[PDB]
Amino acid sequence: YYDIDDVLADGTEFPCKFQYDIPGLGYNPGRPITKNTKLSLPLWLARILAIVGPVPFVELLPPDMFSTKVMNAIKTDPVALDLHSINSHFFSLAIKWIMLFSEKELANVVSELLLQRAQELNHHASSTSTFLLKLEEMEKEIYKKSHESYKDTKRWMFK
Amino acid sequence: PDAVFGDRVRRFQEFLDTFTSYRDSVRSIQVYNSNNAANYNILPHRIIISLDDLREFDRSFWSGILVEPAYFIPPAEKALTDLADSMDDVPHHPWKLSFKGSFGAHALSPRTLTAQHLNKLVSVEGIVTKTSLVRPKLIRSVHYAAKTGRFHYRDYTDATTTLTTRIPTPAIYPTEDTEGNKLTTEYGYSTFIDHQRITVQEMPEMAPAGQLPRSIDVILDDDLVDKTKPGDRVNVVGVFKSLGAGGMNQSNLIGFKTLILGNTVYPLHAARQMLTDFDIRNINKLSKKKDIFDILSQSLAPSIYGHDHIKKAILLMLMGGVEKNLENGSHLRGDINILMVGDPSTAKSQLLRFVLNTASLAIATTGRGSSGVGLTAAVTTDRETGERRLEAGAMVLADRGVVCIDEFDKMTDVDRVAIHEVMEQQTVTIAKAGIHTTLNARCSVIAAANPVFGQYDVNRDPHQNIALPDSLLSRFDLLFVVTDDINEIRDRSISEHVLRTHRVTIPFLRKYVQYAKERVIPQLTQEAINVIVKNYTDLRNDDNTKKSPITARTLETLIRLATAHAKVRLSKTVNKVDAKVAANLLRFALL
Amino acid sequence: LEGGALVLADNGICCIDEFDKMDESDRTAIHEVMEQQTISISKAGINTTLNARTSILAAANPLYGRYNPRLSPLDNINLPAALLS
Amino acid sequence: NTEIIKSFKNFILEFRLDSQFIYRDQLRNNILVKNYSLTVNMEHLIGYNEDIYKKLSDEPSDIIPLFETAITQVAKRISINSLPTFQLILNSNANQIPLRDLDSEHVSKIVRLSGIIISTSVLSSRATYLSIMCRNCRHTTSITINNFNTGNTVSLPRSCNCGPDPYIIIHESSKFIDQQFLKLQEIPELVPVGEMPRNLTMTCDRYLTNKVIPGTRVTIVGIYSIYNSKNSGVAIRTPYIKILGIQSDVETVTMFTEEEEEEFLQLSRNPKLYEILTNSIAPSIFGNEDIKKAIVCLLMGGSKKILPDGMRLRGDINVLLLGDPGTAKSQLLKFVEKVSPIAVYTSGKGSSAAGLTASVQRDPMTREFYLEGGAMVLADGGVVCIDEFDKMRDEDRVAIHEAMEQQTISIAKAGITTVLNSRTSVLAAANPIYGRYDDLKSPGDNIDFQTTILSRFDMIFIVKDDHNEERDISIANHVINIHTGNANAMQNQQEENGSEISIEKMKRYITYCRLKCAPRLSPQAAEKLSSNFVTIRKQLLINELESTERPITIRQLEAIIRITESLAKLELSPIAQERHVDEAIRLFQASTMDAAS
């Protein structure tokens, strides 16, 4: 869709092996790619790739960003975790996969992390140091709204 | 004891009952412990636990161990040993827990530490240096009172005892216990722990811009002792101990010597390694091809043009060359050593960085250098308790590994004479004050040197162009001169890849080679001999009218070279087919 | 004091390498070791001359890089004439 | 004594400078931060109460604890556990004092001062709180160091038989802090006379620590005092000084204010943004703009390419100032050091006592060993100025050959063999041999003998000073104008007013820039260049067809490549321009000309 991040969300390569042989390799001279060839794929294509069958066209292996080592690591110190490092496009992204695979488990998990970041990021509302760098872009923008919110507020405060 | 201690133990029931995977693992220890009991008429008590379960168990008990492990831990210590009793109580003792993590906060490197991170179990990683050597330490004591008999008993607690602070109780040592009978020291019934202490420097890779690294200490006890040599890359995890006075201990500035105790300290490669099946089968699949080796060659120079013959020699050096030691006689040198030479901007030193990475052992060298390089240089005086302790230099520290040398020509000849001892003899010899020993350095080695004078490395004769006479020439199995000669046809090739520079898999290689190292040595086959005998002889029969030096040592390399390719082929036996490869690079060695 | 080498090798053969690199300090000693049956130290308060019965053999390398047939004898050798005599 | 607390608490609350009060703001501002800190303006403090300032100034050390224990009070109001005491830093810029004069009178007197630090100690703990128990009575107690001037100030009380002082340390329950132990030296300019500059150990605690890079020019405040120690007399104590606060001239520190980016954006928009810097480097200097221009390209930092494998592009290049005296190149580098945020001026030999080789030195006590430091390490990741490079001893001169490329030094001295990282950008000013005639000679036959020394160098400049009448009289008078009434110096104001760089801000600009953009060349620039040097590679060999001896390397081209990002970095653009590249060609062509001679 029209948000740069929307198309930006589909751009990252996703390591999904196909269910079928595919003559006319889009990437090269297979020409067909043998069934269960493991390859990273852009989300947009991969979005509907296995969506058509009735068996799905791609096995669609789960993201390393979603690794159990990731999902547990976040359980420790999300405040300390660098989301700018992980993807960095994540919540706007993972929601797609979580929309894609339709799992509730990490959802009940990650959403809280979103809050955990939020609480402290609310501390940033006051007017640094190094934490600001680890924020995701969508996670980064949120502050712009808040920073200027009080900025004009305090600048409004006097004269 | 507070139920807070008894409850935390009681709080550890359902865990590790769930996850119960550790329950039988300790039982797996129980059995093997029983196993050894079966044969003799070895495993450490301490067990690994992924911290993670606490997040599915107690998040308060979770972070608390990260907060006040000093408290939560000791009860967890009991239940393990306690259940350890229940696990096997039939037949007639720290039982520590590691925690890989499940991190972290508490994830920090040594360069950035505390004051808050103090008194908390934390992962910290880096070089192992300088790693104080081990000494034995008692805890329990026992005695006999004659003539009334019975048996005496005594316990001890130091400053580094357990985890938490406890009342210091140096006892001297138990004697004449009432009634006043003579008490003879009794041992082996009494308890002992060999003690170890080491610091660790933070990585220069992760080191900041303009500042020096600060290595920080950690205690090593029981199995924790001697798990690793000094200089290693490893991540230590444990609570940070602040014990000791601030000068207040004696009424009268700086204060509080401090270090982390325990726990895991997982060795880290940045060897090891896991292999499995799928992976090694690629090795098993790739091994069949005789076409693989050039691929092995081409993968070596991602940024580098050609010199593939120079490349081929590198992997053949990775093989090790199949050391064969004489029975009750001296071994001939197994491994191969080489030196890159040629006009400036060769990217020879650049190549060493490639030699510097996947190689995994070992340290390189740029010119000077010393005093001693791999020499211990007699670490002294004392250090500690009046005890003289040598600490091996890089050349020793690099044993069973790679040695790269930059500016080898600039290096002082003083230690060069030692490099004769370093290379031909392939062992270290030491007498200084001092300790008197000869220790093995078999380390694989390579160096690099500029032309003696200017760009004339082409025109002027290669002799007088060596820059480091004489036997130094005999030592190296290969010396490749790099001509700086330029061609527009060449430069045209030189551009785009240099252009693509700014804008088959490598890691698979070192796994392919590492397993290729212990399996399997090709030994020897006369068929390889049949052609090479006419070869090397003919080499002395021709080359001596062309170049030099020419020695049987160069012939000895032929066995090394073919030995390596036989490994490159993963051949269980040598083949004459490999010699043509070695001879050709040896042809390229001359030309 | 701890002696060795020549003092240790006395009444027996002494094998030797890098004989050209033994420099002067060795040469004069073995120069005297050719006078044999003696080792002379006037150093410190030590005035002693101790018997060295050592059998002597050392192999040494020709002038760099290797010997040149055009090179005349004794020009090729790196050792002193009185040492070879 | 007591209740003087509320008076600060009053100024903590009662104070409002219109329209908005500060420190009360700063507190909550630090609250969510968990900063646990306050920076006080002392010159501001007098504005509140005239009495308490000097009332504080009388024995400031004793009223130190009267603050942070007070600041927590309403902070605790605002907090509504555990809550460690905040760290206050008061500061003043008003009367700066020379290091040359420290009078015992100044003991327990707060003094703001400029300074140049030699170094600082590795951090060590101090326990702000501790629990302690009788080794006998089983009696439970707790103690704190609430504040301190090291004394040692406190010890174990001996009143629990049981004794003596049976109470003992408990570290787990105890809570801790840190100290830097800075060693600061006076500014070299004045007033050492013929005597060597005094050096002083400054005490940094908690937040004070890690706040300053070693060797940096800094302004600091704190209290004069003396510690007996032992490790003097009769009964004489060694001098030491508290650091509070230290407000140091920025940076002198990766972070900066946001509006700075914008004012730079104003600079980034300028079409002359590069060309104005061409003038800024040489306010007093006249001509040699090419070499003058060749300065800036190195100023922005070299190409760092770390992508696998571990092979990485280096920085920043190499440059040679060689030419007859009257080149003003040594005078040039003196400007160079001033322009670099971190740089080392070296005319040696070494400079001044510094080992041109970073070298090993033993610890006096407890034996052991450590890196003694080296100029490459001192300035690492920054500018390098070198004079007498031809006068350099060739042995450690060898180490230079390594230092420039691999950019990592390693020594086996003693037991510590570790390989240090050196990212510095060196520039060689060494004077050519025999004046003019060496140009009548080969371009070589100057540095050492071999040009292999030149091989490691990138842009090497041979100054040709020609005696042209009009050319001299221009700068000739330009010289007099440099002098009283400093007519040229007043010209910069209008240049400061209208356009021209202030160069201290520019340093911040560069430091801004150096960390900001990572320019990657456009694909067509390279092919434009690939087609370029292949000619140059082919052409100079056509000069080599005569067997003429002088030179060329593929490293020669790579150096040029770093020029691509060089000015482009000034542009701030993500990728190198096609057009942008060309000036690098003709500029390096002027460098190639030196080979042409």
Ligand SMILES: Nc1ncnc2c1ncn2[C@@H]1O[C@H](COP(=O)(O)OP(=O)(O)OP(=O)(O)O)[C@@H](O)[C@H]1O
């Ligand atoms: N085969 C090659 N492939 C790519 N680049 C090369 C090659 N040979 C030389 N170069 C270039 O030449 C330069 C070599 O610089 P480097 O510092 O690596 O030289 P070095 O190995 O130290 O040689 P020396 O010891 O003679 O200085 C690099 O910029 C590199 O890009």
Ligand SMILES: Nc1ncnc2c1ncn2[C@@H]1O[C@H](COP(=O)(O)OP(=O)(O)OP(=O)(O)O)[C@@H](O)[C@H]1O
């Ligand atoms: N382009 C120039 N701009 C300003 N002054 C100059 C210029 N060229 C020469 N001078 C004057 O000439 C004198 C040169 O003295 P200086 O000591 O700087 O020479 P140098 O080139 O640094 O010496 P060396 O050649 O030994 O490095 C200075 O007083 C300087 O003002």
